[PDB]
Every structure is written in C-alpha cells, then in structure tokens.
PDB file of C-alpha atoms in Angstrom:
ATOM      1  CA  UNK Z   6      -2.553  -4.961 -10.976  1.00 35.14           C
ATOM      2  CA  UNK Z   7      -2.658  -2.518 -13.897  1.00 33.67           C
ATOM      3  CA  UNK Z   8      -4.209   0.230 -11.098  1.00 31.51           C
ATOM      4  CA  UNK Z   9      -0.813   0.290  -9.613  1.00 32.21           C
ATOM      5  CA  UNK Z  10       0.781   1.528 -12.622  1.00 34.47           C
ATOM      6  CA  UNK Z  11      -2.573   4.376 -12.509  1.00 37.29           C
ATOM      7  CA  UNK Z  12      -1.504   5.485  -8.817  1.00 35.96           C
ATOM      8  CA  UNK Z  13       2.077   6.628 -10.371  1.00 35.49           C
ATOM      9  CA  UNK Z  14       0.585   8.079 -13.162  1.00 32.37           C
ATOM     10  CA  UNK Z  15      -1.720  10.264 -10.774  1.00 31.29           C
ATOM     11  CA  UNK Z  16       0.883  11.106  -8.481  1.00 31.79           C
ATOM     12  CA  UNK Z  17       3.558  12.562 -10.991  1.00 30.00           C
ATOM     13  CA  UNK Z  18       0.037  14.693 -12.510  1.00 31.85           C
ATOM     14  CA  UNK Z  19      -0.223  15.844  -9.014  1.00 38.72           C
ATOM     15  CA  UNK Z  20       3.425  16.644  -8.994  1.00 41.58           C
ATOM     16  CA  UNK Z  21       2.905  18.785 -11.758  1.00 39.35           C
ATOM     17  CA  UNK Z  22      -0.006  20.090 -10.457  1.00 41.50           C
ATOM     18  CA  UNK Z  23       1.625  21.025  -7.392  1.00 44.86           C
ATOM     19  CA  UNK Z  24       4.725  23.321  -8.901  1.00 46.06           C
ATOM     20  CA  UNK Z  25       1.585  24.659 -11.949  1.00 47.29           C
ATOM     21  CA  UNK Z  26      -0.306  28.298 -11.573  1.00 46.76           C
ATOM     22  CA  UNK Z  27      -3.330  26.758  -9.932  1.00 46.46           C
ATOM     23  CA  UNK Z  28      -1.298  25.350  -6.891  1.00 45.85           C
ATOM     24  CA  UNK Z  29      -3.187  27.699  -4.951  1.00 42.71           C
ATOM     25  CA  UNK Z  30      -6.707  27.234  -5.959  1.00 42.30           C
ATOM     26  CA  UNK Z  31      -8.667  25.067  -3.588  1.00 44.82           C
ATOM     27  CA  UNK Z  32      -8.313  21.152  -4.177  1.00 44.27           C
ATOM     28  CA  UNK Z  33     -10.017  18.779  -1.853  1.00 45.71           C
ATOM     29  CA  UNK Z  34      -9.045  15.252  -1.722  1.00 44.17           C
ATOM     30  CA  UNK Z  35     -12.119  14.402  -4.126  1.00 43.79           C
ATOM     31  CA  UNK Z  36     -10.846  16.352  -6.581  1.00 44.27           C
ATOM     32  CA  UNK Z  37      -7.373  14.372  -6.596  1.00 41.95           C
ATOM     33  CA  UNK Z  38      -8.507  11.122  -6.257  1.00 43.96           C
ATOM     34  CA  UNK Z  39      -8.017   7.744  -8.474  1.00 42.89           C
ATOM     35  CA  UNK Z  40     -11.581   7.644  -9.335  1.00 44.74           C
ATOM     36  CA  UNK Z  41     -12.428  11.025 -10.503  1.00 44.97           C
ATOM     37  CA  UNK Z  42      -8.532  10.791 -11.996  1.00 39.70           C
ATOM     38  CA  UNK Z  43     -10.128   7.882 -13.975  1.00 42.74           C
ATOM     39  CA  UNK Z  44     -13.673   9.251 -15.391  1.00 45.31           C
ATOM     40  CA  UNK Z  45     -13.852  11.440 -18.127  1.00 47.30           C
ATOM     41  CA  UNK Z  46     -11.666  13.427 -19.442  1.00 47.59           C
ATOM     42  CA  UNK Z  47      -9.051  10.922 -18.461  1.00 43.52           C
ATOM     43  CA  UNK Z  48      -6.170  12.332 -17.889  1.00 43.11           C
ATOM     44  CA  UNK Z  49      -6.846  15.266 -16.407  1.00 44.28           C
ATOM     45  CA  UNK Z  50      -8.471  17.300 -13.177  1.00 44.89           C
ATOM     46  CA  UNK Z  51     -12.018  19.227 -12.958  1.00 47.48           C
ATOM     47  CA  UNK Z  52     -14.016  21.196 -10.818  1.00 48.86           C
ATOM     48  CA  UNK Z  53     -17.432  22.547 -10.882  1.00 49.47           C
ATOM     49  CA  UNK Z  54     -19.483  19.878 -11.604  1.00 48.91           C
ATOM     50  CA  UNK Z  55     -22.701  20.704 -13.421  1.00 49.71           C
ATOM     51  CA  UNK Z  56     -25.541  18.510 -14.610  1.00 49.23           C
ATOM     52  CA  UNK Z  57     -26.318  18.098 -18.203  1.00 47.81           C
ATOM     53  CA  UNK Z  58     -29.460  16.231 -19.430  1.00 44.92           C
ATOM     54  CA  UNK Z  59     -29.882  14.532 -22.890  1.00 40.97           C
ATOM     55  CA  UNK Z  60     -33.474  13.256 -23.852  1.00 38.11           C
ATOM     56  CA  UNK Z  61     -33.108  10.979 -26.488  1.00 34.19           C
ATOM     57  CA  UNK Z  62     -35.804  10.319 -28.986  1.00 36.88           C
ATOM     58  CA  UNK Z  63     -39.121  12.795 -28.464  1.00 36.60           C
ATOM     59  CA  UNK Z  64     -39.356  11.334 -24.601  1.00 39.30           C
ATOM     60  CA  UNK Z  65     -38.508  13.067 -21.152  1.00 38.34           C
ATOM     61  CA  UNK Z  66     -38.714   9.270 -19.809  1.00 37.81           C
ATOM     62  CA  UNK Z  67     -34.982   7.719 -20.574  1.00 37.62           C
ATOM     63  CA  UNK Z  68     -33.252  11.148 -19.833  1.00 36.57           C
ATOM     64  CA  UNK Z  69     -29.729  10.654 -19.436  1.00 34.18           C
ATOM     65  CA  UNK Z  70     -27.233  12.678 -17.530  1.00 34.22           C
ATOM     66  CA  UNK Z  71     -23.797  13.546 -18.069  1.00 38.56           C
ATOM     67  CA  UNK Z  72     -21.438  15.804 -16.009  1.00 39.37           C
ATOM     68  CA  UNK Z  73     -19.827  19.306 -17.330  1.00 42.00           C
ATOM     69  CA  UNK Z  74     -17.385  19.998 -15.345  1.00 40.39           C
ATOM     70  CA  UNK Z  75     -16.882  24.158 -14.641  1.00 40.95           C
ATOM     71  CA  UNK Z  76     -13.165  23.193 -15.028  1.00 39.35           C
ATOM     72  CA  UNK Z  77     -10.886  21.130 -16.778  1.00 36.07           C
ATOM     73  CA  UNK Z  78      -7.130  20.881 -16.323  1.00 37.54           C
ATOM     74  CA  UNK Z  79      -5.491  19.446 -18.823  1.00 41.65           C
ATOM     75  CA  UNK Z  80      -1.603  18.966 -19.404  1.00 39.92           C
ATOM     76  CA  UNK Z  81      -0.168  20.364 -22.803  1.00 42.31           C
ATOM     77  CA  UNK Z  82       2.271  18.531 -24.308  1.00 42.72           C
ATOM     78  CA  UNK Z  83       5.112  20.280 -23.009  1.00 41.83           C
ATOM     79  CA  UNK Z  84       4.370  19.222 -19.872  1.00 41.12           C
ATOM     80  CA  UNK Z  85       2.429  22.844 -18.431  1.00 39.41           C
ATOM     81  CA  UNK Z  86      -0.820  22.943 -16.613  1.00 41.81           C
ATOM     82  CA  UNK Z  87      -3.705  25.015 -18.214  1.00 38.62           C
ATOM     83  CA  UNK Z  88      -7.377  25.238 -17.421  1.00 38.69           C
ATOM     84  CA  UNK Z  89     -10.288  25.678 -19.836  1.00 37.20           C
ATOM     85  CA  UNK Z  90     -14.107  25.303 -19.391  1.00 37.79           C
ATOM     86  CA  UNK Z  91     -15.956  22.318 -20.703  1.00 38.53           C
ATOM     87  CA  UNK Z  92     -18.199  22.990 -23.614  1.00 36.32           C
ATOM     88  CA  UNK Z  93     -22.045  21.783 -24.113  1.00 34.58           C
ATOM     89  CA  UNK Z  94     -23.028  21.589 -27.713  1.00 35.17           C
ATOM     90  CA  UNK Z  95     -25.598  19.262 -29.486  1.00 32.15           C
ATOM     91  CA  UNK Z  96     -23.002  16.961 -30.794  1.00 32.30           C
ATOM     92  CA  UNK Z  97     -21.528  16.541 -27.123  1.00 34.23           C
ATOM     93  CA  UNK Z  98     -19.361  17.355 -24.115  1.00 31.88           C
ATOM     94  CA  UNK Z  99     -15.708  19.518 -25.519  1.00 28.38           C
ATOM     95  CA  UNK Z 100     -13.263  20.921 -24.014  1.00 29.66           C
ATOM     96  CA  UNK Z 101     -10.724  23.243 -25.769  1.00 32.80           C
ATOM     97  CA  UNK Z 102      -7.430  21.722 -25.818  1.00 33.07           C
ATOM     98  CA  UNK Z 103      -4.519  24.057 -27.291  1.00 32.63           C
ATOM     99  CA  UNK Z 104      -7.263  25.623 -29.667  1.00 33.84           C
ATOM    100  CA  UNK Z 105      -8.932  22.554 -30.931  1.00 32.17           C
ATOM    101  CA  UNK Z 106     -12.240  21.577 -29.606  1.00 32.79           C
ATOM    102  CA  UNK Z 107     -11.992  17.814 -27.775  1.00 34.24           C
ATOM    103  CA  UNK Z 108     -15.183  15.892 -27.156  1.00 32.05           C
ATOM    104  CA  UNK Z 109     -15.136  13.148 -23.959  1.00 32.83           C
ATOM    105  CA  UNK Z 110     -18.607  12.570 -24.689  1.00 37.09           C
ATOM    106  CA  UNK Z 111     -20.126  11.944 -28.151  1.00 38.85           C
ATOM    107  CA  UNK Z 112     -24.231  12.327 -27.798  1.00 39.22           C
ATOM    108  CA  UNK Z 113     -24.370  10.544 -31.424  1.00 43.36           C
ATOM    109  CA  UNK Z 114     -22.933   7.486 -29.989  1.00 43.60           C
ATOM    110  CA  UNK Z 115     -24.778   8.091 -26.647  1.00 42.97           C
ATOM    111  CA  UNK Z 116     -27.682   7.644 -28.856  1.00 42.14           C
ATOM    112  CA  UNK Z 117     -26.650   4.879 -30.458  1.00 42.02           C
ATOM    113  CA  UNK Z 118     -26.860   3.194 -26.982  1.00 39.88           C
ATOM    114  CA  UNK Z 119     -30.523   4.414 -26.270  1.00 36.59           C
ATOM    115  CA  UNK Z 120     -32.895   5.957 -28.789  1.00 33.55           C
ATOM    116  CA  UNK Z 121     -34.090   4.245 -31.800  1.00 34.33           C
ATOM    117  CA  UNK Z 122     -34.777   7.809 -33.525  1.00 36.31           C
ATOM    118  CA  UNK Z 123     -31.478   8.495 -33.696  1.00 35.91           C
ATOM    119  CA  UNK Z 124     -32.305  12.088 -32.605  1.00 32.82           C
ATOM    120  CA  UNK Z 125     -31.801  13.421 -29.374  1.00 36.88           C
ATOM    121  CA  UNK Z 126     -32.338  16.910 -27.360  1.00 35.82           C
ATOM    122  CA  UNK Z 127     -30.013  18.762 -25.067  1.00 39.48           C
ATOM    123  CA  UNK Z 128     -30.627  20.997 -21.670  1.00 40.80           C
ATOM    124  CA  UNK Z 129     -27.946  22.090 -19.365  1.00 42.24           C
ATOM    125  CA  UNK Z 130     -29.361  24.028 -16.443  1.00 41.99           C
ATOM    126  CA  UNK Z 131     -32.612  26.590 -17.892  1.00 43.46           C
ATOM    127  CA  UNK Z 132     -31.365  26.215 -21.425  1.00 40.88           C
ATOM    128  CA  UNK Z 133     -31.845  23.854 -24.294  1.00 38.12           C
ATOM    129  CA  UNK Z 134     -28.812  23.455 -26.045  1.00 38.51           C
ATOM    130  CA  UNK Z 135     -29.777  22.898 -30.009  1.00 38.17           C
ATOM    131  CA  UNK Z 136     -28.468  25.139 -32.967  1.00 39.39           C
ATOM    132  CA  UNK Z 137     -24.865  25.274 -33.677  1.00 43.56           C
ATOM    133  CA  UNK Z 138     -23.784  26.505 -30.731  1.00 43.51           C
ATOM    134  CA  UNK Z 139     -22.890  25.635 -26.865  1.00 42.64           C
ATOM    135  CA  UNK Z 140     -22.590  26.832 -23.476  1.00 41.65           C
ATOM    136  CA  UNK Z 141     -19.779  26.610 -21.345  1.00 39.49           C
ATOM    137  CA  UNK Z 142     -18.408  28.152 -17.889  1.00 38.60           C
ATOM    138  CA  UNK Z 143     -16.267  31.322 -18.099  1.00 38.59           C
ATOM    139  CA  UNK Z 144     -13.431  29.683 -16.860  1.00 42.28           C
ATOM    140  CA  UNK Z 145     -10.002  30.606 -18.575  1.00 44.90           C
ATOM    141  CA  UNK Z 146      -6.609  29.714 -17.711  1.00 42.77           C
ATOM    142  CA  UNK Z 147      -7.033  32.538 -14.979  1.00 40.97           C
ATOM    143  CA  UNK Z 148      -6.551  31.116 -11.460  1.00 37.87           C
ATOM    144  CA  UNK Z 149      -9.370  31.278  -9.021  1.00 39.03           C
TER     145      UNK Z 149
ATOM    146  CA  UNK N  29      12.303   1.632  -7.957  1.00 36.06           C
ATOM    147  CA  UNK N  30      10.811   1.285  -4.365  1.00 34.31           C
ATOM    148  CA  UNK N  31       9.467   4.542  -5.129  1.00 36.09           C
ATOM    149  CA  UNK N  32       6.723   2.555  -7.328  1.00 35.53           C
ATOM    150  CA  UNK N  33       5.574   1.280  -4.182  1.00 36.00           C
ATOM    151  CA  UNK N  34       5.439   4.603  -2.006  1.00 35.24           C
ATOM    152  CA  UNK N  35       2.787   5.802  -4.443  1.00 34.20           C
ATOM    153  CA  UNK N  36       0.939   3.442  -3.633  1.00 38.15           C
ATOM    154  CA  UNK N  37       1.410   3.761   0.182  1.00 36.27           C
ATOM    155  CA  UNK N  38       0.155   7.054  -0.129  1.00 35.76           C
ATOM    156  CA  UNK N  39      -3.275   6.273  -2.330  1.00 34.97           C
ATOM    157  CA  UNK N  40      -4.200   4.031  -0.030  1.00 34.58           C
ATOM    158  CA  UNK N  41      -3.828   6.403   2.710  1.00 35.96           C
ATOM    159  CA  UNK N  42      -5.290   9.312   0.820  1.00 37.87           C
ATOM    160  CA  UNK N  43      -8.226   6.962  -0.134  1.00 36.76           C
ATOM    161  CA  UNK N  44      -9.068   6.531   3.812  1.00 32.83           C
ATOM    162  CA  UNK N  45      -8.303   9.953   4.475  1.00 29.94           C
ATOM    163  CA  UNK N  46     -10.565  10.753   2.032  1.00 29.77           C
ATOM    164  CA  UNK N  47     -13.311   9.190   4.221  1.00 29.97           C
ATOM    165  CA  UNK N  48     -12.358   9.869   7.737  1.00 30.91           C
ATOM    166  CA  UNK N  49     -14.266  12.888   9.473  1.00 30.46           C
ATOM    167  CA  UNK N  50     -11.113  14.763   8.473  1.00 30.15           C
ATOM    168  CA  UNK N  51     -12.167  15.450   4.570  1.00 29.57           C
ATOM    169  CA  UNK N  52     -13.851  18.156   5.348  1.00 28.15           C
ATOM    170  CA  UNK N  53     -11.129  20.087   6.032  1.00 28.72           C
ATOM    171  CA  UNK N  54      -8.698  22.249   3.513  1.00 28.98           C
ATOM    172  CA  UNK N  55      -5.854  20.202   2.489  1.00 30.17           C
ATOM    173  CA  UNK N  56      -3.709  21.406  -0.212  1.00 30.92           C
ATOM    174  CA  UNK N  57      -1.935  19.544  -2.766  1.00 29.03           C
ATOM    175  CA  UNK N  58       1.706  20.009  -0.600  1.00 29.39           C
ATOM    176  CA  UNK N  59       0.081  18.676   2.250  1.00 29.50           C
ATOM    177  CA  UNK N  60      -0.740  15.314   0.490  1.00 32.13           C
ATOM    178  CA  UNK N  61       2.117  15.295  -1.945  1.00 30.60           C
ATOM    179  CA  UNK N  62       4.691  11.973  -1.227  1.00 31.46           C
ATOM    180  CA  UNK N  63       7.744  14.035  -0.359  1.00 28.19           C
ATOM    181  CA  UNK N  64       5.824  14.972   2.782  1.00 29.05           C
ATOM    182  CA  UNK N  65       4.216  11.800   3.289  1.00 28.98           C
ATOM    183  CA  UNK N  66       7.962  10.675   3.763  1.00 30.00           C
ATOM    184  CA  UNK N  67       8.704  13.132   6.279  1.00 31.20           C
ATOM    185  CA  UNK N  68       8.832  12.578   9.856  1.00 32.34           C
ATOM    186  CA  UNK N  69       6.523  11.147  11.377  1.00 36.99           C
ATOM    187  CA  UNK N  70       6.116   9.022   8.080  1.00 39.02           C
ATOM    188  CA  UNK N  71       2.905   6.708   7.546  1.00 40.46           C
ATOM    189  CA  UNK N  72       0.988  10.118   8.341  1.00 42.01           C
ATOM    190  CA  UNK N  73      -0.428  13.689   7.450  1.00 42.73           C
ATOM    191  CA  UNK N  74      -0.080  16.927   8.827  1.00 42.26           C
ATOM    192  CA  UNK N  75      -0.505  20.612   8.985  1.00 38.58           C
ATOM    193  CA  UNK N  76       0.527  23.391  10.363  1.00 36.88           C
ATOM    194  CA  UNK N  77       4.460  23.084  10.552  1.00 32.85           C
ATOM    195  CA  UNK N  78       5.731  25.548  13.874  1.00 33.13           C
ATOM    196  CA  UNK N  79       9.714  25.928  14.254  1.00 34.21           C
ATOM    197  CA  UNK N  80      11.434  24.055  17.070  1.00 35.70           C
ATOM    198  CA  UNK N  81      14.831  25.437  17.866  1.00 34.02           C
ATOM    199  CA  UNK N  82      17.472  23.519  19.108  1.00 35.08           C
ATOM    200  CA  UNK N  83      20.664  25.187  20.657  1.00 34.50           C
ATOM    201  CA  UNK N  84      23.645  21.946  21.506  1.00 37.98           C
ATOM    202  CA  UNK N  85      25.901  22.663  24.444  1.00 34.92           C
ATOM    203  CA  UNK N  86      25.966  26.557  26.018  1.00 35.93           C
ATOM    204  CA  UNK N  87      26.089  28.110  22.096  1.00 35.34           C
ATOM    205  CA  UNK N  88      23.330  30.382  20.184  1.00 35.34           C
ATOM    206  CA  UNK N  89      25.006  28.920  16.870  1.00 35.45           C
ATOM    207  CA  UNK N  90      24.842  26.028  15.711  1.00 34.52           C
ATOM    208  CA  UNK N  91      21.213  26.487  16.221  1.00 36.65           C
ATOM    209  CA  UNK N  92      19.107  22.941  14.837  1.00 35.78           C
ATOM    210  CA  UNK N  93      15.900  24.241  13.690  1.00 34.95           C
ATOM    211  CA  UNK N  94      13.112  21.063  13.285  1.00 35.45           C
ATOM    212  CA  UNK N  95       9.135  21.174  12.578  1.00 36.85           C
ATOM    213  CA  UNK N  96       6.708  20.679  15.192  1.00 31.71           C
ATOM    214  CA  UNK N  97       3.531  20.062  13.474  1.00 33.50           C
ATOM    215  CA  UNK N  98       0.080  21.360  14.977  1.00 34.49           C
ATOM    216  CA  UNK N  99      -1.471  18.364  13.599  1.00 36.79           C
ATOM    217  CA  UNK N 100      -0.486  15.286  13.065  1.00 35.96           C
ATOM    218  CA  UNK N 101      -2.974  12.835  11.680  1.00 31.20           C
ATOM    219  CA  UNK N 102      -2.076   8.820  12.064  1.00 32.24           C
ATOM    220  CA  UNK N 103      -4.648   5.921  11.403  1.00 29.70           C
ATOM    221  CA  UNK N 104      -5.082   3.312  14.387  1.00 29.68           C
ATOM    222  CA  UNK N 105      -4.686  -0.162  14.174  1.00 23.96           C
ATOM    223  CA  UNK N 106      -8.330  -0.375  13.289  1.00 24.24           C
ATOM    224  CA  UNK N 107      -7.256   1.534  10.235  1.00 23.34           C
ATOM    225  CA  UNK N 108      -8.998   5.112  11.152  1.00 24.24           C
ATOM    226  CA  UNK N 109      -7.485   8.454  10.795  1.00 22.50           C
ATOM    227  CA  UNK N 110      -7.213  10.274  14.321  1.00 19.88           C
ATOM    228  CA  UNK N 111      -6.369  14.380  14.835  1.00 24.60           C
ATOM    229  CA  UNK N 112      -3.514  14.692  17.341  1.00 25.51           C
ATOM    230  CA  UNK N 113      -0.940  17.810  18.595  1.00 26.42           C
ATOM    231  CA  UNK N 114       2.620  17.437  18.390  1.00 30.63           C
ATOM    232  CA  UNK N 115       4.534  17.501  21.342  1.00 30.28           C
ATOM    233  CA  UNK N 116       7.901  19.446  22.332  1.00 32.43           C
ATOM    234  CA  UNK N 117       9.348  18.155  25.213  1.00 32.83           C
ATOM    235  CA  UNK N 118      13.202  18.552  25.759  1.00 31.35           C
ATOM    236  CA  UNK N 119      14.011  15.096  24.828  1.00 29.23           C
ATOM    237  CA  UNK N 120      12.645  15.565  21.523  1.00 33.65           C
ATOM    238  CA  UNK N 121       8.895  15.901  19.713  1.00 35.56           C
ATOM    239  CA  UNK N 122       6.083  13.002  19.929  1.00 36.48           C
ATOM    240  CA  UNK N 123       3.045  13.024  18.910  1.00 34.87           C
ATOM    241  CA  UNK N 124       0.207  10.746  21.550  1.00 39.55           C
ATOM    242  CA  UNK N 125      -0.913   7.988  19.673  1.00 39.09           C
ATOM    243  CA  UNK N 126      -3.939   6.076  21.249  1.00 40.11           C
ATOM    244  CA  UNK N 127      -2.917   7.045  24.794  1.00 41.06           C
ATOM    245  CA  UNK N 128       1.133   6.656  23.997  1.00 40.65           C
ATOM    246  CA  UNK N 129       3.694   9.119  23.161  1.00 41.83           C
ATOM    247  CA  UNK N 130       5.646   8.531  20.122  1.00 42.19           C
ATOM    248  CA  UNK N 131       8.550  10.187  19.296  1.00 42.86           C
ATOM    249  CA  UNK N 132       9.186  11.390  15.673  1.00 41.70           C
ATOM    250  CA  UNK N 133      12.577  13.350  16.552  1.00 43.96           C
ATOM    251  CA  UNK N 134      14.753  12.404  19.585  1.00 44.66           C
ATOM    252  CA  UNK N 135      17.085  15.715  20.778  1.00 46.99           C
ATOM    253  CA  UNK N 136      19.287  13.244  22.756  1.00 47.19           C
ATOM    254  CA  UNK N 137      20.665  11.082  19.531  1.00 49.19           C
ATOM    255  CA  UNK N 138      20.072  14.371  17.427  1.00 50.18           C
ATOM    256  CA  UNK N 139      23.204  15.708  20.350  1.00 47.03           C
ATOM    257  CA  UNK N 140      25.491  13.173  19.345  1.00 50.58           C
ATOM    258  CA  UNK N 141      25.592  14.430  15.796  1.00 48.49           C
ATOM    259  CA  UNK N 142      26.399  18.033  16.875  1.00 50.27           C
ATOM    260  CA  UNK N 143      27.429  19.021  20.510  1.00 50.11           C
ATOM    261  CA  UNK N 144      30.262  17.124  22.183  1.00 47.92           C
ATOM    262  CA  UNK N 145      28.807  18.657  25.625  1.00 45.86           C
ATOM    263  CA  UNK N 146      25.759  15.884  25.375  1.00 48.93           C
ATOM    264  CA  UNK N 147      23.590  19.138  26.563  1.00 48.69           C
ATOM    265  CA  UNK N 148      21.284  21.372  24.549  1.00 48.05           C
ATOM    266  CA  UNK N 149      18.367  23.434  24.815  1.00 51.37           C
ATOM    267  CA  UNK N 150      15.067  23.912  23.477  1.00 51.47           C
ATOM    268  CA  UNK N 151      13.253  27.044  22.318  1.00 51.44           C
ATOM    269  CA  UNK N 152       9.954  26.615  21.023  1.00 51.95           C
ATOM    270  CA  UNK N 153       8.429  30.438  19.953  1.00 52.39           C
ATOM    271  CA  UNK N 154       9.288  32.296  23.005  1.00 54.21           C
ATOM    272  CA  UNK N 155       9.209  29.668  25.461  1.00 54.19           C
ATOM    273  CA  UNK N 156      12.095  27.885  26.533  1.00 51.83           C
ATOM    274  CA  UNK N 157      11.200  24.050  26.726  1.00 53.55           C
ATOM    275  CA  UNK N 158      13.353  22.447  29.607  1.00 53.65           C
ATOM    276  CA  UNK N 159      11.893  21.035  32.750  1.00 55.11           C
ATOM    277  CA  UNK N 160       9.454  17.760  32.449  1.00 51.30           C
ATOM    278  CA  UNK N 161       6.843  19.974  30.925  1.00 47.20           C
ATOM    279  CA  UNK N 162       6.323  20.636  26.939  1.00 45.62           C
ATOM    280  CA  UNK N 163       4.448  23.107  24.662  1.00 46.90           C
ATOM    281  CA  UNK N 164       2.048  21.041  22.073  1.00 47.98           C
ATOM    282  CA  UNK N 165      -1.085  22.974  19.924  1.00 49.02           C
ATOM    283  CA  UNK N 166      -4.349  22.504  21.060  1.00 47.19           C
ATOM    284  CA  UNK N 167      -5.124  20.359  18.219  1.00 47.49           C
ATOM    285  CA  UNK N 168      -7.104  16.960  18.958  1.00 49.46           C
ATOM    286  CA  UNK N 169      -9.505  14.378  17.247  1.00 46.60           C
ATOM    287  CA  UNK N 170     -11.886  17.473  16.435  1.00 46.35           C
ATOM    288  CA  UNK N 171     -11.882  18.651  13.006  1.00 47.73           C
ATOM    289  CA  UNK N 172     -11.057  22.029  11.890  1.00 49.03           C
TER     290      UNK N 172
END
C-alpha cells in the first residue's frame, strides 16, 4: 500500500514535532492523525478550524465551504517547526511560508469547477472578503 | 527496517484510540510517540509514569528504579481500548487485563541480573511494598 509509506512520513513529522517549540501546546489525537495529515496543506499540522464560504456566480444557492485553519505548522527546509496563520483573500486560501505567500486553495480554479460566471464572492465569519486584501488569525510563530 | 512496520503498529492503534471513550482526554505528543509505544508494557498507552524503587539483597545502593504507570491503556481481544492501574506487588508490576494480572516487569528475573542474595525489596513513594498486598492508582475504565 502506498499509505504505509504515509504512516512513516507522519510519524518522523511528529518526531519533529515532538523535540519543536510547540511541543507543549495542546495536540489531541485529531490533530495528529493520517487523515487531517493528508488534507490540505499536505504536509503539515493545523489548528483552529474556521469556516470560509465562497458563493460562486451572483447565487447564495451552490455556496461552497472551505476550512481556514487558525494554525498552520509547516516544516522549513532545514528541518525546524514554525507556525503561521492561514490567510483568506479573494484569490484563495495562503499561508505564509518563509515570507512568500502559499495558496492550498485556488478560488479561480474552485470556480472553474462550479460557476459559469467565472466570478465568485468571499465571506469568512461577518466579513466579505473582496478588495486586495485578506483576513487571517493572529497567530505567529509564538507558542500558545 | 522492521521499524517500517512499528509505524504502522502504532497508526493503527492511534486510529482506535482515537475513537475509544478515551479521546477525550489530554494526550501529548510523548505520550503517543513510538519510542514509548515500545516501552513496557508494549502494544499499549499510558500516562502518568510514578517511580518504583527496587533495593537487591540488604543494600540502599544499587537501587533499580522502574515506572509504574497510573494508567495503562490496552485494547481487548474485541479490539477496544480499556483504562486500567498499574500494579506494584513485590514480585514485580502488572497491570489487570480483563480480570487477569499481567506482568510487564518481573522483580524475581530482574534479581538475577543484580543481587546474588535472590532477595530485594520494594519501595513504592513511601510505602514499602512486601507482604501479598500492592499499591496500584485508582485509575480504571473511567475517563479522566
């Protein structure tokens, strides 16, 4: 199976979890499992799910809802730990990763999948996220 | 490497620990991590590590020291995660699982590595653990 080969690669993360600065925030076993290990961002651990909803096209019928997580933990490529919130813009779901802005979810192609208009409206939580900008957690590489 | 494997061993478990009546409960990354999971008693979890001293033939040093864990979670044949105490008895620690004690750590073999006399005694805290009786936490299938 090409999932056993995923176990080890989740494991060692979780070594390097487990010796990293946020060893002693809270993780449940949902947070560390294969599944959530597997969904996007791949490759790394979040907390703090929070509910974003796209309505494509000028309809609130076909909304379609993505998860921004509060957290994201993603390894840098010298192997350390750090932790960044995950960004909500028009164009998609970011994270910041070592100062450069990385999208796991595209909205364009989202829209591409559902939406003949080829436009598309944002709202995460009370706010409707249009312009050129985003919202995002507070969370910083600062432990909780 | 048969290490590969162990992974493995370990998601699986994690996977139904994840969804016993235990998951509730605050389990950090050291207490799943696979160096642990291959410490006695192996194939299980557990918190809560106490110090069991162990003094071989009528000498204060060469003073064993071993982990008595206040709870030791194991999976029953029917594959489900049960909450147990450990046990300290003077012939070594066990842990009752379904209605049997099981013994993790045996003081009499654990002799014949280190006390010609074939006598030793057992300090648990600040109770001395000799007669038929032993000291255990009050741990059991309730969660925490």
């Amino acid at each position: 199976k090409s999932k056993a080969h995923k176990a080890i690669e989740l494991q060692m993360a979780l070594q390097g979890l487990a010796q990293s600065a946020y060893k002693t925030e809270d993780w449940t076993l949902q947070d560390t499992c294969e599944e959530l290990w597997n969904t996007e961002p791949t490759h790394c651990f979040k907390k703090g799910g929070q509910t974003v909803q796209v309505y494509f096209d000028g309809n609130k019928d076909n909304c379609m809802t993505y998860v921004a997580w509060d957290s994201v933990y993603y390894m840098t490529d010298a192997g350390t730990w750090d932790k960044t919130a995950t960004c909500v813009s028009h164009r998609g779901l970011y994270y910041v990763k070592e100062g450069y802005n990385t999208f796991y979810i595209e909205f364009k192609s989202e829209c591409e999948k559902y939406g003949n208009t080829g436009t598309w409206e944002v709202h995460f939580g009370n706010n409707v996220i249009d312009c050129n900008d985003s919202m995002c957690s507070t969370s910083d590489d600062t432990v909780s």
